[PDB]
């Protein structure tokens, strides 16, 4: 017979209806876990490169007519790309290039947030600080991130028991290199007994010729010590041995009399 | 009348450990230097340990670590607790007190035997 034919009204998209994939390269990377990024209408046929370009992700199926989200599952970051620094959270991988910039066929990889805080970083900036590679910032920050001991996570305080082994190994061959002499200045900053007592240990531990050297203020000579007695005030106060001397080099005992000095006012 | 009679040496095998002390009578720590000295049979003394007025503390480098000099103002006793005994710190040890700008306020007390047997 005769239908009451109606078409439905002209339909008006909505802002998720109008998302771009292509186009929110800054948007799906700072995602967090369980945090559903909706990218909006996907083609079938881009599934296979929107997951291929963010492996870190699922693509989830949220709405009809294609409109899906990237749930975040991972933090794929290296340990050379995502511990040498502290300002870098992601970077994108390019015919076997890692870029800081974005590229329409390059992969995002990004790091755990606070990932030096997790322990993760400790092995590789071991290997990466011991050597000519040493950067100063990158090395004493990554010290001071070290003695941070109460924002680390579990496997980062058992990391840490395991670092501070380590570098305890490690310092008792040589303390004159740069990363022991920064783990030293940030014993020092410490200043609790375990602190003090790792510290004696490390330089009492040390060769001959690194304490004739480096250690001339805490191992006088018996003419010095026998002069020293001819004042009231410490020898490390008047002595030349400890006027010019690093103090990172110096046994807890010079280092506390350094300050026991009464300044004449 | 000054009283600086050390005490407490002996005879320990090496790795032992012994407490020298040395209790002043005539003489306050808080104006004073205290030093332990040592003298062997055939060589001449030398500086083991001293302590300034203020508890600043330095040792000679052949004992630096194994001995530790202590000093207790209310009883007015310096100690020299000396652990890891080696057979070169075989001496008697003693007891010395220097004002601390008198200068010539030098005084020596009796020593005490410590002996070492490899």
């Known amino acids: 017979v005769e239908l009451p034919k109606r078409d439905p009204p002209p339909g008006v998209p909505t802002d998720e209806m109008l998302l771009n994939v292509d186009k929110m390269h800054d948007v799906i990377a700072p995602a967090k876990l369980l945090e559903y990024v909706h990218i909006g209408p996907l083609a079938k046929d881009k599934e296979d490169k929107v997951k291929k370009r963010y492996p870190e992700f699922r693509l989830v199926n949220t709405g009809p007519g294609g409109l899906s989200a990237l749930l975040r599952q991972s933090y794929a970051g290296t340990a050379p790309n995502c511990c040498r620094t502290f300002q870098r959270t992601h970077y994108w991988k390019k015919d076997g290039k890692i870029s800081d910039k974005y590229e329409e066929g390059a992969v995002l990889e990004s790091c755990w947030p606070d990932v030096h805080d997790t322990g993760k970083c400790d092995v590789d900036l071991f290997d990466w600080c011991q050597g000519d590679t040493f950067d100063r910032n990158i090395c004493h920050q990554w010290i001071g991130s070290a003695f941070n001991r109460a924002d680390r996570t579990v496997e980062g305080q058992q990391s840490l028991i395991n670092l501070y082994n380590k570098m305890q190994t490690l310092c008792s061959k040589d303390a004159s290199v740069p990363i022991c002499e920064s783990f030293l200045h940030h014993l020092r900053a410490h200043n609790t007994e375990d602190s003090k007592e790792m510290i004696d240990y490390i330089l009492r531990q040390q060769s001959a010729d690194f304490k004739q050297k480096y250690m001339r203020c805490s191992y006088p000579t018996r003419d010095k010590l026998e002069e020293s007695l001819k004042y009231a005030e410490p020898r490390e106060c008047w002595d030349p041995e400890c006027s010019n001397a690093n103090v990172n080099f110096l046994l807890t005992r010079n280092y506390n009399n350094l300050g026991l000095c009464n300044i004449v006012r | 009348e000054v009283q600086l009679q050390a005490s407490g040496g002996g005879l320990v095998q090496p790795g032992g450990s012994l407490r020298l002390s040395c209790a002043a009578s005539?003489?306050?720590?808080?104006?004073?230097?205290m030093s332990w000295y040592r003298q062997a049979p055939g060589k001449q003394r030398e500086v083991v340990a001293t302590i300034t007025s203020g508890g600043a503390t330095d040792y000679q480098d052949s004992v630096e670590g194994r001995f530790t000099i202590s000093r207790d103002m209310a009883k007015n006793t310096v100690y020299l607790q000396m652990n890891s005994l080696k057979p070169e710190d075989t001496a008697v040890y003693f007891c010395?007190?220097?004002?601390?700008?008198?200068?010539?306020?030098?005084?020596w007390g009796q020593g005490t035997q410590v002996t070492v047997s490899s």
């Open positions: 005539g003489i306050v720590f808080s104006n004073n230097r």
């Open positions: 010395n007190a220097r004002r601390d700008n008198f200068a010539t306020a030098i005084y």
